[PDB]
Each structure stands twice: as C-alpha cells, then as structure tokens.
Swiss-Prot record, chain C:
Belongs to the V-ATPase G subunit family. Subunit of the V1 complex of vacuolar(H+)-ATPase (V-ATPase), a multisubunit enzyme composed of a peripheral complex (V1) that hydrolyzes ATP and a membrane integral complex (V0) that translocates protons. V-ATPase is responsible for acidifying and maintaining the pH of intracellular compartments. This is V-type proton ATPase subunit G. It comes from Saccharomyces cerevisiae (strain ATCC 204508 / S288c). It is found in: Vacuole membrane. It comes from the Eukaryota. V-ATPase is a heteromultimeric enzyme composed of a peripheral catalytic V1 complex (components A to H) attached to an integral membrane V0 proton pore complex (components: a, c, c', c'', d, e, f and VOA1). Present with 2280 molecules/cell in log phase SD medium.
C-alpha cells in the first residue's frame, strides 16, 4: 500500500518523519505561491511578447 | 436556620500501632475496623514526627495508607497512625480571601488557621443537566492580547498553552493582579455589589517562582481579592493533586454560595499530570498512553467542569488552567485532553518569546470558543468583535507576507503587504507588547487597536462592517 | 519617593486601627459566647453514643 | 540479631529482623557486609547490599546498626576520594595493596590518625547551643583554612565542657552538651543521613551568577550560585570543559565532584587530572583538590552504591554550605543514576511508568535538585552558603524524549541542551541555543544593573538575531539566497559570525579557556555593534555585498577579539575592546559614504 | 523619561507598602478572631479533667466509654487499658459491662474482659480507657483527652455560627 | 604460591530428585543448602554427563540451566551431582595455540588444560583508584579505523555489523594487522610485538569458524591464540559461558602473564539470544522486546573486563562482533552495547552493497578514547584535525546527497558539489582497502590530506590554521 522509505521504525525516526513532513508542507505552500507569482509575471511577459 | 449543630457530635478516632510493613510511599495496616473507601490519617514517626497520609484500598479488613512526604524511617514496632473521621475537607469561609495556603490547606502566611464556616467535601458533586446556563459576560484580564482578541467569557474554561522555559507564570501573575469585571468600567463606577474574587493555585511551582507569586500578590491589591495556593516541587506530590481540588472547592464555595464572580487560575497542569502518574503507579496499575493513567480524561473533566454560570446563583467561575507542553506538541496527552475538555486555548509562543516580546501570546493558533458571548453593546464595547476579526486578518496577512519576504523580495509585494508589514511591526511592538505591570482596560485596548488599525484606509478594512467604520474610524 | 515614604506611618496607623476595630468585636463575641461554647463542648464530650455500625 | 533467608541479586531478605526502620543500614553476613533495608514485611526485611552476591547460601547473620545511610562530615573530607557510600579509596589502597577492593572493609570514612588544630568558637561553658552552631574552627587546608566545626543540626543543649585550643584527632571529645540532664559527647565530626536534607534557617533567593567561563553559558543561559543546572554530559567539551572550568574559576569555596555509571577509564582520567590542576586564589597556585572532594562510583560498582553516590555527594555539599562556603556539585551521568533507580525498581518488581522507569523519578530528582539553593545556615552566627547542582544527563539515542530529561526540564531552572547537529560538525561547546533556557535571566537583572547594565538587553538582542537567522536559514535551505534582502543577508552572516567566534570555545587554548564575564560582555557589545552598524549602513544606499568586502578588516577584528588573553587584566583588555568598538564605528561611518 | 520611570517605580513601591499594610491588618484581624479558640479548648480540657477527677461522677462516664468502645469492637474477648488510678472502678463494674454490652449488641454477653497491667500515662490521659482487642492488636483510643481533641476541630463551624451569624446564601 | 590448599577432598552430594524440566533448564527439589551459582554435573539415564549453572535457589529448590540441553532429561533416573564451587576454567599459559569447545573442553585431540590455577568465570571488580588510561594507539592498518576511529591498546570497541556483511573479514584483517603505531620494542625487538589473540566463537557457522582458524594459521597467529568455538550445532545456552571463558583466559594472559591480548568475540547477538532464551524460560520480567531486564549488567560484565590495569605490563584489547538484527543501532543489543562500550565500528549494509571493503561507515562509528591517543609524540600532530575535517566533510556530503535527492543539484551550493566529489573519491579510495593491504596511519593521513586538498584552505574551517598552513601545501 502506497510506499515506504524502508527505514527501521523508531520514535526518533518518527520525529524526523514529522519534521520532514511539516518541512515538505511548508515548502509546498512556499513554492506553490512562488510559482503563482512567477506565472503571473510570465503571463504578463508572454502577452508583452505577443503585442 | 443553619443546621450545623451536628458538628458538636464527637466520634471515636482510633490509633493503630499495627503497621505490618512499609512498601515505598505506602504503609499497610492489617487490623482496621469496618472498612470504608477513603479517609485521612495523621501517623507519627518513632521519633515523634507527625506525618499525614491518605487511604487507598479497601477490602475485608484491608487498609493501605499512602503517607505524605514519603515513608522514611517508618518501622513496624513504634509507628502509630491516627484515623480521622472522614476524607479531606477544607475549612472554608468568606474571609478566606487574602490568605495564602499550602497544598494541604494549612495557611503558610503568619495568619492563623482559617476560621471555618463549613467543612466542604473536596471532590464535589455532579451538576444536574437540568440546571445549567451559558456564559454570557466578559472577564477583563487587562492584557490586550487577551481582551481585544481571545476574550474570556464569564464562565469560560480557557487554558494557556506554554512551554517549559516560557514566562507563563508571569502572565498568570499579571492576569491575577489585573483581572476584573468590565462592568465597573461600563457602568460608570456604579456597580460594586458584583464582587470579584480570584483563586490562584500553584502546582509543582518552583521555590523561586512560588516566592515571586507570594511577594508580588502581597505587594499589590490582588491579594485582598485572592485566595492563594502553593505546592513546591519538593513538597509531597499528592498535595499537588489536592491543590487544584482545594482551589476549585474554594472557588465553587465563593461563587455559588456568596454570589461572587470568581476567576480560577491553575498553574502547571503538567506537574499535576506527573503527580497523577506517580499516584496511579503507586498502586499496581497498568500505565496508559505515554505512561499517564488511562482515566486522566475523567480527572481533568472533573477539575475543569467546576466552572461556569449556574441556574439561580448569581456567581460565576472562570477557569484559566495553565500547562507546559513537554515537547511543544499538541499531540501530548495533557494539552490534547485539555483542549478536548476546555473551550479554545491561548498560545504562548517560544519564538515570540525569544524575539523579546512580552507577553508572548501567539494570536494565530489561539482562539476563544465563547468569545461571541463576551462581545456586545452593553457587554464590552460595540466595535469589539469586528476590531478583533480585522486585527486577526491583518496579522495573518502580515505574517505570511513576512514569510514571503525571503522568496519574492520586498518590491514584489502589494500595498496590502507593505501596510501589513508595517501593521505587524507596530502590532507586535506596541499592542501585543504590554508591560508586566501595565493594566490596559478593555476600552483602552480597543482604542489602541483602533489607533493601530487606522493605518489602513477604510476601503482596506474588509472584516469590519461599514456601520462601525462610520462610527469609530474617525477620531 | 520621600512622599511615598511619608505615608508609611499613616498606612501602619490605619492598619492598626482596622486591626483594633476587628479585635474589639472578636474579643466581645468570644467573651459573650465562651461559657456557652465550653458548656456545649463539655456536654458533647461527656455524653457518648452507643451504636453498632453493622447497620 | 538477624538471619539471612534468601538472596537474589544484591537484594537480601533477612528473617528475625523485627524492629528495623526504613532505610536503616545493616551489617550482612560474617564479613559484616554493608547493606540498607528497603522493604519491611513483618520480620522479613528486604535488604539491598552494596556489593557482590554470587555463590551465597542461607544462614549468614545480619546485625542492624539502627542508623540510616549516613555520611561522616568533618575535617579530612577535603582532598579525598570516596565511593558511593563514602569509603576512602586512597585509604583502601593503603590498607589493602591490591587492584581489588576488599569485600566489606570497614575502614573509617574520615581519617582518624590526622590531628587538626582546633580553635574554640564563641560559645563557652553554660551557653545554650543549638544545631548548626559553630563552636570551633579547624585549619584543614590552605584553601579551606578555618573549616568551621558546627554542632549537628539535630542536637541541642547547654554546654557543660568545651575543649581548649589544641590538636585533636577525630577520636577526641571536643564538646559536652547537656539536654534534660543527658550529657552527650561531641567529637570533631558527626554523621548525617544522606536521604534527609540538612535543615536551613531560610532558603534565600539566589542572587549571584555562578560564572562558568563558557561564553554561551555565561552570556545567553546564565547560572547563578545555588541554582540548579542540567548540562548535556555527552562527549566533547560540553561536559568535561565545563567541569574543569567550574573547578578552577567558578569562585566556589569548594566543589564536590560525584560520578555514577562512568566507565573505569573515565574515572581514572578524572582521578589524575584533578590533583594536577591549580587555582590562583591570590598570587598562589593551589591545587583544586584542596577545594575538592570526589565521589568515584563506577559502572562496576553495584546499583545500590550508584544510587547512593550522588546522595552522599549532595550531603557533603550541604555540609560545606552549612559553613557559608559556596559549593558547586557536579553530578556527571545523572541518567546513570536514574538507570540505577530503574534497575532497583526492576529487582523489587514494582510497576514503573513511562518506559521502564519508576514513576517517583520526577519526585526524587525534584527533591535532589531542590536540596540546592542559596541558604542561611541553621545555627549561629548567621551564615549564607549556596550549593549549585551542575548535573549531567546523557542521551540514550533520544535527546529529550527520555523521562529523566523530561522531568529535569520541569524541575531545574537552568538547562543547557545538546545540539546534535553542532556535535556532528565538531562545533564545541555543542549546546543548543534554541531549546536551552535559564530562568534566572530576570533574577540576575539586579546583578547586571550594578556591573554590566547593558548585558540583559544585549543578550536579548543576540538571542533575537540567532532565532531570526535560524528561521531564515530554515526557509532558505530549500530556496536559495538569491531573493534575500540585504537585511536578511546581514542577519544570516552576523549569526554565522556569532556561532563561529562567540559561542564557539575550544576550551583548551590559553585564550578563552575561561572567558571572564567582562570579556564576554565586551564581545557581546562588539558583535551587537557590528550587527546594528551593518544594519544601519544598509538602511542607507550601501550595498552590503560591497560593504562586506570594504569592512572585512572590521569583521576580522571583531572575529579575532575572542583571541584576547583574559590574563592581561580587565583594564587593558576593556581598553582594547573600546578601541575595537571605536574603530568599527568609524570604519562603518567611512564606508557608508 | 528615566525619572518618570523612577517615579512609576516609586508609586509601585508606595502601592506595595499600602498593600503590605492592608495584608498585615487582615492577618491581624484573623489572628484576633481565631486566638480565643485555643483558650476555649484548653479550658474545656481542664474542665473535663476536673470532672473525671470525681470518682462518683466519672464511674457512669467511664462505664459508658468502655461500652461505646465495645459496641464497635464487636468481639467477645477484649482488654481495657486504664490509668493507675481507679483500676478498681473498672474492676467493680466488670459484670455490668459484660451484660450491658451483650444486651446492647443483641449478642451473647462478653465472655472475658481483663484490665491490662500496662497502665495508661497519668500525666497525659485525664480519664478514659483505650479498649483493645483480645490480642492487643486492635486499639480503640476512647479517652477524655482524645475525645476532646477530636471534637475540637469538628465543632469549628458550629462554634463559628454560635459566635457570629452567617454572611452568604447557603 | 599458596595453592597447596587445593589438596582438600570435598565429597559432592548426588541428587536423584529432579522435580521438573523445561526449556533449557531443569528444576530439582529437596536440595540441601544450595549455592547460588555453583555448577552441577547431572547424568542422563543414557549415561552422558552435562554441566549446568544454578540460576536461583529457593529453600530446597534449585533451578539449573544445563548447558548441553535438556534432551533426554527424565525425573525417574536423572541424578544431579552438586560441585561445591561455581564454574572455574582450568587456565594456563599453555592454552595458547589450542582450540576449545564452548564449555572449555579441548576439541583439537589434545588433553585437558594442565591448570596452573582455577579462575571463576565472573572475575572481580577493579579498584578505580588503580586504573590507567589506555594512551597507546594500535594501528589496525585499516584506514577507515586508524584515521577516524583509532583504537587504543586497552579499548573496548565492537564491530557493529549485520547478516551477510564481512565482519569476519574485518576482524581477521584487524587481527592480522594489529600493531602499535609507535611500538615500545626497538625494531620489534626487546618487547612483545605480537598480540596474543583470544577468539571466542559463539552461535556461529562452521564456515566462519573454519575461516577464522585458517586465517590464523596462514598469518601464523594460531600458535598464540586460543579459540573457544561454540558453533551453531553446539548447545545454545553454552553460549552464556563461552565469552566468560574467553575473557577469563584473556585476563589470565594479560594481567597475570603480562601479555597483550586482543580478545575477539565472534557474535554477541547469539549470546544475547541465549540470555533471552534463559530469561524467557525463567519467567522473568522482560526489559525490551523479550530481552532480560538485566542485560545491561551482563553486557557490562562481559565488556568491562578489558583495558590496562595499574602495575601490570599487559592489556586486553576487546573487539566484540555483533550483528544488528535489522541493521539498526536502536535494537537492544547494540544500544546496550554502546551504552557501556567506549566506541564502535559500524559496518554499513548500504556501503557494502556499493562494493566497498571494508564497508565501515564513519558517521555512526566512534572511538570514545581516541581523543587522548593521537597528536604530539603519538601518530602525527595533524591526525585529530584531519579526522575532524574528514568527518565534517563526510557528514556534509551525506546532507548534500539527501538534498540532491530532495531538490535539484543546481540548488546545491559549491560546497555541496565539492562535498559530493569528496564523498565519491573518499568512499572509492580512502575507505576502500584491500583485505591484505595494511596501510600505516601515516599513509592513511597522507591519503586523507590528498582527499582534503579538493577543498580550498578557506573552507577547512574545522582544523587549526597552524595545521592547515603546515600541511595543506606539502603535496
């Protein structure tokens, strides 16, 4: 089911997993909004190219 | 009439020099007559040292006593134990305000033993579901971080979540010294028969911090309204368990018999949970999740539900339990159950504390589940809820714009984000930042929030209705 | 600071006045009811009750 | 009076042992094995024994001494080495001459042959004397000159006879007090149970900092005299350097090093490093051992001795605090003490909490830590001592999830948590500046306002800089430093400079082996001046990429300020720091234009 | 501004002095209110000792004390511990105690009761009897001093109601 | 020598009163004054004789763990003879060059050991006031160990490995190439140059025992080694005593004959499994996942009997080998090992799968007493800083590889690309080493410097400027 990282399970590894997960979530939000800004500027630039 | 004449009856309290053995903090008695569940004892060491204890288990001629402050030096040939009448009962009286008590209820100031009006059972009673009412007022804590936003209703059970090194004790002391009803401010100093009292309980509190509490409340007018309790870390831990029970019994007596408005503050619920763990493991009991006893939910429910307004009686109990996160995690049993039982919470943030801001209440993750009832026209001021919502929205926008500062650069932000960064700086530096001895009344807090929210033009204040903007923006 | 220290004696005088005012009533009540309380306590102590806790 | 019934592990059940109180120590077997009772069930008293148990059989007699586990307090404690139950190891070698400790050897815990010079105190014949009263002083060392001989705390009476000035061994009557007609002889020493704390007239709030010398500790996370402390205890300079610095420079009148669970090699290391370390009290090199007594429990020692080691140590520290001495107590590997408690609990079969540890762990560490604190001595004349616990926990794979650290965080007032990442990068001292805390920062405000008034605000600003740069590094690792503004770059590089040149101490070089409080404050203000000068400069049009190159000289100067030799004296080095600050300010002013 | 901060600190110190004075006044009022209870209890104890000093009056009281101890030590053999004084008082009423214990408990009369030779402390016990089981292993401390000590704390709210009226709606 | 007291006949008493048998242990009742740890010879009805320690005594009941298994044990005909003393290995200097069974019996067609003395297999505690720190580094010849985790003569250090990893090869290589970096003997003359190995094989394959024997023969170490082989087909709880037999004969040689013993324990995991089996058959309280709660003390007893002692010219260098059951340090066996040992060598499965030999991972590996065994007058003055720099660069390489797995390579800094380059060349050239290479620590340090010269001087921040500008430009 799904996939796993084949790491030995311990509560220290669990702590690393939750901190990595929250880091991944904050990176997802950060790069998603960065891409939103970049695509806004990119639409501006591409209509500029068109005209 | 007062049917207290039964107190003159004298009952034979027995003395047993029949200790069979000692096992940890427990002593076991073989021959005790006619067993009933729980009592209180005063056993004497062979060297004459008088020690107190409780009763734990009961079967056919089976009695086990859990001695306070350990069982060092207890032998089976000289120690004697005296069985008092019944379980622990606090001597409670109206003039208990202004007194400082140990975890066992014995006063620790230079005053005498409290002149009891009645001995009240410590556990309490189950309030009938047919006789409860909603909390429908506001308790002003003087802290603008808790008044304008995260307002505490008159009967709301709202905790304060903090960590080990953070100054939750200082915030508790400030709340206790500054708490009061908004009504005297609202009623133009006409309302004074609505007396307000505070019951402060300190559990596992450190000796220096306990000294700080005692000295600070003594050196201010808070003590006259405060009945105070301390329990040191090196003190017996079942006394730490008794302390919140004593505090809530006193608060319940005051509010629901003297018709007072009582604010109850419990400090370091984590120490209380540790004491629960120790006592639960004292008997041969299987540990639960994270070692804590499996019934901690029920015990915290019993402690917390001793709050709120009730049918008939004009008093109220407002509870502010304060606990420390063992690992800064919500998932820990103590904060989890406290959030599951109480209404909302207040967050004291580690990073906000390191950044040199006091009091460091983190507004974003903190909510008051009953803030609507504390807000109104006669209740506090009319603009209170809208100003709170606008402040929360602007603070969130400032926060995520500050997060984006390092990704898109300052120049890539909109005027929304420029004004939001300015608002966040001024906010966390002047509004949330409040002097430890500074008492902002709720209207002063709202005025500061308006002068700080006046940064934006009326167009940009979306969360506030125009009916309020046409009234309060221009001053 | 000196003006604040000027009221130290006045505050102590007011505290002593309040303490004396309360103590007067306390002593009067104690003197008026000590005999009755002692009689009630002696009657309670000297008169035991015999019963079996089986029921 | 007694008889062994059945033995399993270091736990002995003795029958016909009626009347024995709890924690009373007994003599077990024909060798008079030292053993303490822990559970009573009628005549069957469960005795834990402080040594080996293999190949035994029922029958050995047990004699009960009637006393708790006590420690001999008096002259001769200092400069000596003891085990967990205060058996003098040097005397053991002198009386055994072997690589093995004799089984059940009962050599006196405190030297009786040496006769000290006794100067009678204020009290005379007929004067009423209570517990803790100093009735005479004793010259013990050049560092512990005038070792105060005080009446035992539990004693009281009127003096019927006091010995004159002279030389008396431990075995000589010094004072006779009469209480209710019962005249009791008092010698130059007295015993005192290790479990019960020594009574105190009043526990004073700690007010003076215990200067350790490590800049991060003394600056960000200060420890006061009498206050409690938790140190990382792990490998590196986190623990050993701190212990040596507290020994040599902490201005403590005595130190009580106690070790439990340390490997024999580490014990050997400690036992020879200490005698060769010296302190300059006043123009004189004096050995730290003259100001040190050491408890040398190891892993080979049985669990009962491991449990009792720090109790003996804290009782010694309390005894020396009762004379007004400011005593520092280092309990290395307190987690090994907790493991000893766990093993004892498992032997007893009592149900633990958490994972495997007894539930009363929190209570016992709370009591042991609260035995510390600035205090007013019990007797007369009034004194003011202070015992400062510097206890070392040890990670066991987990950093803070272990119960011992979890309890300590709520108990202790000062915490210096290990930074595993810094240790992985060989950054020493490797403590974490995010999770470590010191609650005395508000208490020390009065101390700072009298000597270094800007110290609290400077420490707050340094902590703010470190936290802001930490969050900015966290957000930039996955993005890149391209988008960061000049202020963000300044914050990151200033925090890197701080981490690499203020927090970092090798602890071995002649410089910054012990960084004094004034040098620490001077470098704090120098680093903060660098940071806010750069921030103000880039508040103008100064590009910080050019500014860093143009002020590399000032950056190197503020970095190398840590190389100043503290032995030069506060005057000239403070002048050097003032010169550095002026040069920094003028250079930044020049580079701004 | 620094002097304004200093003046705020001075005002805080003045408020601290006022609060300390108020707390001292309240503590003194409480001390004055609660001082008389100990004297009342001591007078009651002295009166009880004097009452027990009279053998004629103490005989029914002592007999009733032994009986109320027996009805809760429901065993057919028990030992009574008394003072060096008036041991013959218990001796003379042995059969009376047996029969009245029997008829009050609706059981058989006490088959055996013996006065323990370990006499009570005359200096500490001002009358009464600490009746113990047949094995001397279940003690019932029913003494004139013990009863007064037990009742002194119990009767506190009633004493307060007698001394002054209520101030809250129970 | 006062051994003349051995001429004392003590008539052993034979018990034909076996009460019950289960698992690896037998219970016999009606024992007259049983001794706690005394061993017993019990004869099957077949007639064979097996040995067994007494686990615990209880009145007249004795519990005996028969080493050679309980197959064939009955109640009717089995007789147990109680030897008055505990287990004692017949020890002499002549057992070097002999191969012994797990019970100490010879298995090389030789006779029984003509004992000079009998030594209890448990030993005695060493006075801490008479201990000496193991200063003298031994050059194992393995660059992964000499440079990073240098072993000093008298250090306890395991080879943490797993199933299928070449821990046996690494142990054989260390045995072959063991030797002081600065030997006391001038040109290997005038002092004991060669270590006298004591190799205990427990719960091990016949292939591994054959490999170790053949390697000792080829290197010539067989004439100065004693092998205690307890193979897989050998009795399971005979593995309880074989490490004790090996360590007692090692203590004899090192502390009594003043030899330098290199003790190698083949598989501590099998010893732990035997301990778990005995504890489970004893119905004792488990400590972790079925392992006994006293395993900490057992492993302390096994491991601590190593190092140099004051006044003796000998030492014991103990290098136990243990296989982590699931490649994890967090398992109870390696966890409890590291808690008392003074270092470890981590054989890494991922490193082995990459073809690298020896597959020693340096990040988990540590030598807790390496700090005071290198530097001026011992090895070279750059050894400590070079090791620190290599460890830091390897850790940064792993971090950068993880980031490159997470994000793109271009997001990595120049430091990170240099770290990957250094890591690749490091694993392929410095850690990698032939099984018969025996490169000296100075060659290893020169190779380490050649590796470090990938980076410029500025970013070797973890080494002192003196060492850097002294050694970087030597080339």
């Amino acid at each position: 089911s799904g996939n796993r990282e084949q790491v030995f399970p311990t509560r220290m590894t669990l702590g690393l997993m939750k901190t990595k997960l929250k880091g991944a979530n904050q990176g997802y939000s950060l790069l998603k909004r960065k891409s939103e800004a970049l695509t806004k500027r990119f639409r501006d630039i591409t209509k500029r190219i068109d005209d | 009439k007062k049917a207290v004449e039964q107190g003159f009856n004298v009952k034979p309290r027995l003395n047993y020099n029949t200790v069979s053995g000692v096992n940890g903090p427990l002593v076991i008695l073989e021959k005790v007559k006619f067993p009933r569940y729980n009592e209180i004892v005063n056993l004497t060491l062979p060297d004459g040292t008088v020690r107190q204890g409780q009763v734990l288990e009961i079967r056919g001629d089976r009695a086990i006593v859990q001695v306070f402050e350990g069982t060092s030096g207890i032998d089976v040939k000289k120690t004697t134990v005296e069985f008092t009448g019944e379980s622990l009962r606090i001597p409670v009286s109206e003039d208990m305000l202004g007194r400082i008590f140990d975890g066992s209820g014995r006063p620790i100031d230079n005053g005498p033993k409290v002149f009891a009006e009645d001995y009240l059972d410590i556990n309490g009673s189950p309030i009938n579901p047919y006789a409860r009412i909603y909390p429908e007022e506001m308790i002003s804590t003087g802290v603008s971080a808790i008044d304008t936003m995260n307002s505490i209703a008159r009967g709301q059970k709202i905790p304060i979540f903090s960590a080990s090194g953070l100054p939750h004790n200082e915030i508790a002391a400030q709340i206790c010294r500054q708490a009061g009803l908004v009504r005297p401010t609202k009623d133009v100093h006409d309302g004074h028969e609505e007396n307000f009292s505070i019951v402060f309980a300190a559990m596992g509190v450190n000796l220096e911090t306990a000294r700080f509490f005692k000295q600070d409340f003594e050196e201010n007018g808070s003590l006259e309204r405060t009945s105070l309790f301390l329990n040191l870390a090196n003190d017996p831990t079942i006394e730490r368990i008794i302390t919140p029970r004593l505090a809530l019994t006193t608060a319940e007596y005051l509010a629901y018999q003297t018709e007072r408005h009582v604010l109850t503050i419990l400090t370091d619920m984590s120490s209380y949970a540790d004491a629960l763990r120790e006592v639960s493991a004292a008997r041969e009991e299987v540990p639960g999740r994270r070692g804590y006893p499996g019934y901690m939910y029920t015990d915290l429910s019993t402690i917390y539900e001793r709050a709120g307004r009730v049918e008939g009686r004009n008093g109220s109990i407002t509870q502010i339990p304060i606990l420390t996160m063992p690992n800064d995690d919500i998932t820990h049993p103590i904060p989890d159950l406290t959030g599951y039982i109480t209404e909302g919470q207040i967050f004291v943030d580690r990073q906000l504390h390191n950044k040199g801001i006091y009091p460091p209440i983190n507004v974003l993750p903190s909510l008051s589940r009953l803030m609507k009832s504390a807000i109104g026209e006669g209740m506090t001021r009319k603009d209170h809820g809208d100003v709170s919502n606008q402040l929360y929205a602007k603070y969130a926008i400032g926060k995520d714009a500050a997060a984006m500062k390092a990704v898109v650069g300052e120049e890539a932000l909109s005027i929304e984000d420029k004004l939001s960064l300015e608002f966040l700086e001024k906010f966390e530096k002047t509004f949330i930042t409040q002097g430890a001895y500074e008492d902002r009344t709720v209207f002063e807090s709202l005025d500061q929030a308006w002068s700080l929210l006046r940064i934006y033009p009326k167009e940009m204040l979306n969360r506030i209705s125009p009916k309020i903007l046409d009234e309060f923006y221009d001053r | 600071e000196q003006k604040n220290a000027g009221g130290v004696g006045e505050l102590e005088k007011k505290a002593e006045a309040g303490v004396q005012g309360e103590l007067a009533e306390i002593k009067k009540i104690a003197e008026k009811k000590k005999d009755d309380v002692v009689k009630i306590l002696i009657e309670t102590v000297i008169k035991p009750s015999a019963e079996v806790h089986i029921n | 009076y007694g008889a062994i019934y059945s033995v399993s592990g270091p736990v002995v059940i003795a029958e016909n042992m009626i009347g024995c109180a709890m924690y009373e120590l007994v003599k077990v077997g024909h060798d008079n094995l030292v053993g303490e009772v822990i559970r009573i069930d009628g005549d069957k008293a469960t005795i834990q024994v402080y040594e080996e148990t293999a190949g035994l059989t029922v029958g050995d007699p047990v004699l009960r001494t009637g006393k708790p586990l006590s420690v001999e307090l008096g002259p001769g404690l200092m400069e000596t080495i003891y085990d967990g139950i205060q058996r003098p190891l040097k005397a053991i070698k002198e009386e055994s001459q072997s690589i093995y400790i004799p089984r059940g050897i009962d050599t006196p815990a405190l030297d009786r042959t040496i006769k000290w010079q006794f100067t009678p105190g204020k009290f005379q014949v007929g004067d009423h004397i209570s517990g803790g009263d100093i009735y005479g002083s004793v010259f013990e060392n050049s560092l512990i000159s005038s070792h105060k001989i005080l009446l035992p705390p539990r004693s009281r009476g009127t003096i019927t006879w006091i010995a004159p000035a002279g030389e008396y061994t431990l075995d000589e009557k010094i004072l006779e007090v009469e209480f209710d007609g019962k005249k009791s002889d008092f010698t130059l020493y007295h015993t005192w149970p290790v479990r019960v704390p020594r009574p105190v007239t009043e526990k004073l709030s700690a007010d003076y900092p215990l200067l350790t010398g490590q800049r991060v500790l003394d600056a960000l996370f200060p420890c006061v005299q009498g206050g409690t402390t938790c140190i990382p205890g792990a490998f590196g300079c986190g623990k050993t350097v701190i212990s040596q610095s507290l020994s040599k420079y902490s201005n403590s009148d005595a130190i009580i090093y106690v070790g439990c669970g340390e490997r024999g090699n580490e014990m050997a290391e400690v036992l020879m490093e200490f005698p060769e370390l010296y302190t300059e009290m006043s123009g004189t090199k004096e050995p730290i051992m003259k100001r040190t007594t050491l408890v040398a429990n190891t892993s080979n020692m049985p669990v009962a001795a491991r449990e009792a080691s720090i109790y003996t140590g804290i009782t010694l520290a309390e005894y020396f605090r009762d004379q007004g001495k400011n005593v520092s107590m280092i309990a290395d590997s307190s987690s090994r003490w907790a493991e000893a408690l766990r093993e004892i609990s498992g032997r007893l079969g009592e149900m633990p909490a958490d994972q495997g540890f007894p539930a009363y762990l929190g209570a016992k560490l709370a009591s042991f830590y609260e035995r510390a604190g600035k205090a007013v001595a019990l007797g007369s004349p009034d004194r003011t001592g202070s015992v400062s616990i510097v206890a070392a926990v040890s990670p066991a794979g987990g950093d803070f999830s272990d119960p011992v650290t979890t309890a300590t965080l709520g108990i202790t007032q000062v915490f210096w948590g290990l930074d595993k990442k810094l240790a992985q990068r060989k950054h020493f001292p490797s403590i974490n500046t995010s999770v470590s805390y010191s609650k005395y920062t508000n208490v020390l405000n009065k101390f700072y306002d009298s000597n270094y008034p800007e110290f609290p605000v400077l420490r707050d600003r340094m902590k703010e800089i470190l936290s802001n740069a930490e969050e900015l590094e966290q957000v930039v690792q996955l993005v890149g430093k391209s988008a960061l503004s000049d202020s963000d770059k300044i914050t990151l590089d200033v925090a890197t400079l701080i981490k690499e040149d203020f927090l970092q101490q090798n602890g071995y070089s002649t410089y910054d082996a012990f960084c004094p409080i004034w040098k620490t404050f001077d470098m704090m203000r120098a680093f903060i001046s660098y940071h806010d000068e750069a921030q103000k400069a880039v508040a103008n049009g100064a590009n910080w990429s050019k500014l860093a190159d143009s002020t590399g000289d000032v950056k190197h100067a503020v970095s190398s300020s840590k190389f100043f030799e503290p032995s030069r004296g506060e005057k000239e080095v403070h002048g050097e720091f003032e010169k550095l600050l002026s040069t920094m300010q003028e250079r930044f002013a020049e580079s701004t234009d | 501004g620094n002097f304004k901060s200093k003046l705020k600190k001075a005002m805080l110190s003045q408020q601290i002095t006022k609060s300390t004075i108020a707390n001292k006044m309240r503590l003194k009022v409480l001390s004055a209110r609660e001082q008389s209870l100990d004297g009342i209890f001591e007078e009651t104890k002295e009166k009880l000792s004097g009452i027990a000093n009279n053998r004629d009056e103490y005989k029914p009281i002592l007999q009733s004390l032994i009986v109320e101890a027996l009805l809760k030590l429901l065993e057919p053999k028990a030992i009574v511990k008394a003072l060096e004084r008036d041991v013959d008082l218990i001796e003379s009423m042995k059969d009376d105690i047996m029969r009245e214990y029997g008829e009050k408990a609706q059981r058989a009369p006490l088959e055996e009761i013996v006065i323990s030779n370990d006499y009570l402390n005359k200096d500490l016990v001002s009358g009464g009897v600490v009746v113990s089981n047949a094995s001397d292993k279940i003690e019932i401390n029913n003494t004139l001093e013990e009863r007064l000590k037990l009742l002194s704390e119990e009767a506190l709210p009633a004493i307060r109601l007698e001394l002054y009226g209520p101030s809250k709606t129970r």
